[PDB]
From a paper:
As with other phleboviruses, RVFV displays two glycoproteins on the lipid bilayer envelope of the virion, Gn and Gc, which form higher order pentameric and hexameric ring-shaped assemblies. While the Gc [name] is responsible for membrane fusion, the role of the Gn remains undefined. Virus entry is completed upon Gc-mediated fusion of the viral envelope and host cell membrane, in a pH-dependent mechanism.
We first performed fitting with the localized reconstruction of the pentamer at 7.7 Å resolution, followed by fitting the resulting Gn–Gc heterodimer model to localized reconstructions of the hexamers at 8.0–8.6 Å resolution. The Gn–Gc interface is formed between the β-ribbon domain of the Gn and the hydrophobic fusion loops of Gc11, which are shielded from solvent at the interface between Gn domains A and B. As the N-linked glycosylation displayed on viruses is unlikely to be obscured in protein–protein interfaces, mapping of putative N-linked glycosylation sites onto pentameric and hexameric Gn–Gc capsomers was performed to validate the model. This analysis revealed all putative N-linked glycosylation sites to be either solvent exposed (RVFV Gn Asn438 and RVFV Gc Asn794, Asn1035) or facing unoccupied density that could partially correspond to an ordered glycan (Gc site Asn1077).
Numbering used by the authors:
A (entry chain H): 742 to 795
B (entry chain H): 1012 to 1118
C (entry chain H): 850 to 903
D (entry chain F): 850 to 1011
E (entry chain E), F (entry chain C): 154 to 287, 290 to 379, 393 to 469
G (entry chain D): 796 to 849
Amino acid sequence: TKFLKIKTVSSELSCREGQSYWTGSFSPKCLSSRRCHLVGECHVNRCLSWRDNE
Amino acid sequence: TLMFDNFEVDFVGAAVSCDAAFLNLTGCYSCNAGARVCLSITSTGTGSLSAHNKDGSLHIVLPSENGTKDQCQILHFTVPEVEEEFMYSCDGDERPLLVKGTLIAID
Amino acid sequence: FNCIDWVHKLTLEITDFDGSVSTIDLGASSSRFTNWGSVSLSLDAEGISGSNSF
Amino acid sequence: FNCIDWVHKLTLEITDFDGSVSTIDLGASSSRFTNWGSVSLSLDAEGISGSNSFSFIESPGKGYAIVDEPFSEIPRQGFLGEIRCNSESSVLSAHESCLRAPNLISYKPMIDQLECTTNLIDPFVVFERGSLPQTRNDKTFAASKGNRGVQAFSKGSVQADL
Amino acid sequence: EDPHLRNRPGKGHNYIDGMTQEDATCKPVTYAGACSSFDVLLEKGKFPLFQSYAHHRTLLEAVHDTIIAKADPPSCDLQSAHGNPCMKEKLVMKTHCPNDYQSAHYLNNDGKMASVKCPPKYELTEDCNFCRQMASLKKGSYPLQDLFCQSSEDDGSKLKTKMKGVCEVGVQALKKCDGQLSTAHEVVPFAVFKNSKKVYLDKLDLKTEENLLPDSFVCFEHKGELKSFDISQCPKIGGHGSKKCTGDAAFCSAYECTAQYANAYCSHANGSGIVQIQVSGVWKKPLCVGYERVVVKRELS
Amino acid sequence: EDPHLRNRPGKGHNYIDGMTQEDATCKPVTYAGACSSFDVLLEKGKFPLFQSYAHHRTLLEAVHDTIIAKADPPSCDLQSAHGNPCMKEKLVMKTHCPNDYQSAHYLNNDGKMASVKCPPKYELTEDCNFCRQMASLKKGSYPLQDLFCQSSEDDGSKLKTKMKGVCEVGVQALKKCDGQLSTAHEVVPFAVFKNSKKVYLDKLDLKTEENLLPDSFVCFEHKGELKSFDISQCPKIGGHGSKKCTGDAAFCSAYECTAQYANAYCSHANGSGIVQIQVSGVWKKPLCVGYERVVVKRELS
Amino acid sequence: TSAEFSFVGESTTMRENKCFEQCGGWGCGCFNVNPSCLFVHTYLQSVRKEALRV
């Protein structure tokens, strides 16, 4: 006579995850760089209409 | 649901002897839990003790070792005054053993 | 993350015939492969609805 | 599949003058081809209306079934048909031509361990739960006695002209 | 950074008894020469696993390193009399043979190394069953699998093929199939352990862990990209040796660099380590995980 | 369609009595040569039914294979005085054939072999109803129909043409139309069974299966292009034969698996052997089913 | 029009060409496990003797 014991811990209700993402705290670090007008790339039109990807 | 996919199970015929002793009984009857029984199995070798009642509805299999160890499982009953006599056998020859204990009513 | 359903998980400790001990779990109707075979949860009833608002 | 219209089908055989017997069928106002002319039905009989909110299950070589649930054209989760195909070989072998719902396989990455558990709906539970014959209103839905397809047994008379 | 595809660790031998005529350019295996049993292993779009596992041993290198046992006979003849024992286990092996090659080896279901060949002048056909008349005969052994060998002695005699829906694969009788059999060819991986048979598995899980093994680095020779250099001649850490060789933090963390007094720029090999397979939910150490096409007789009735 | 266009199994003879002037290139029929009685059968947009089923024999090939008998006379003279037997059976057929032709074979009513013959050097016209005096004249015949010969053992003498509302269709005459008669140019397929006549049918339903006959299996030998080989020499299971041969599961399931002692690589045909037709509801295998273009004379009164 | 029914020709009557999927294998008359096909060339015909102008 041999048994196949299947011990039961407890009755739990696990949650079914789906859409997940990671998040956290951050801190921006700005840099200052002032250049006079008509020197290299210091212009009025180039400063007002500037692209973030460039 | 337990599904088997061709699993070979072997067994070695043990020939050791062990004398079981009753300890206590605390639990319930006709409930989901059951009744925890305490047994004192005293053998001289590492084997497996097999026990059963009279009609063949209850079966107790406990690991037998070298020395005096306190083992036991959870049994189910439908009477608060349990007076069923068990027949334990360590290798084939059964021995008389009577158990007792007061149970409580719980679902 | 979030949750869409409360899967009733039952942590089972499968004890083989030779003496091997393996702790697994079963939820809803999934199965877990073992050495002897594969156990799975059958009929269920315990369930909690209303997890999309958390 | 589902049923959009109940066509009054009558299994009628044709015993020719020489002795040959040809078994055919007639539905609503259909026609066939025989070895001596053409048979057709002029008037139907009864007519079950309202079946868009019901679906049937057909098993190859086995009985039929009925489901008390409206049909859905989009494969969504929790519906009888979240993973569909187009043929039996596309299901028994899981062909890439079938459709499925996005984000269905739950992944649990554990560094070097992978466990993919899906809560797939077993169709055999509904097939064995609601299997024909089933008592629905005054009619009695049952299996077919000839061509592959869902049929219905009525309790009226036969009022048709050939 | 990128490991080479020709630097064979260990002995680097690819020859077998009876067809060892290519030992002049295949013992060892380096840039000099052209071994017939290694040119088809680096073909793009043919054996992706061998290209992914660069610094890893093969079947023949495992045979020469006393890892995989040898069959009897290890090199049988195709046009010989009294039948051919190397055909009952090869006919169910759905492979492909191009041209030129005369002999071909395969990992049988007995866990040994078996190979067949034809007497001159006969070569292999489109599969490699019988011989035919035709240019040159490359005296070697055309590989028919895509397995990799490794130095391991993990015992695994308590694990056998336990596939679902498979009645009898290859020549090993699995379960008793009382019904019919669906004789057809398909794709399925496998894994061979120590003191066991060719255990077939439907799914597998590969694991790679980087260590400080000498076979996990590569160096480029130079005076004192580029060409390769023998890494076994590099000294160890806290000592000396034959020649010299420096590197970065990965190569210098295990050995010792001499900077300007070195002759080889060592670097980390991006593709090595110990590869372990997961069978029955337990991580084990395999010896030859391939991916061929066998005839699987599934159920039908 | 079928890939085997010029390859003809068995004998492959396409010559009739009286026009034996093309046996140098049409006996047998291979990829080379120039047989006038076979090149027009593979033309695109002309006889698609022959292009769909090309693994079976033709009409003349069925005659030479002791399948289709010969009429009397087998090749009538389309120029002899005092009339000729091949006249009424030709004026009722509306078929087109190019110039520079002398003979044009077709199917009679008894299912035998009836053809015409033009003495040299008389050529035909656009319709072929009458010959006329004379680039190069073709040394053969022109198939006026689109049928293929095959071996079958299904009786169908009681399955006579049951075309209702039609007086005389094709060549046969169902009755004697004494009142009104409607003559129109309509296409009607035909079918010939065992020990029957030219039975005409309305719709055509094809069926493709396989069997165990050697005609449903092809094989080729390996030597130093494609080289055909006689597949009938393959021994059976537990029997005898001539040259051995092996193949896959389809070819090995019919014959005996030899592999190591085989001389060729046998394969399976692309669906050929048994072609059944759907007539009277059941499925029967005809002998020479086709799809000709004749004149159907329907009734009116 | 498929190659299986191209022997009829470009007809001037009402017709349609449908392609239905059918199972393959040795159980239906094939030598490969890939699914076969069923070419359908159904054309409309008139079975009456007169006509009506509605």
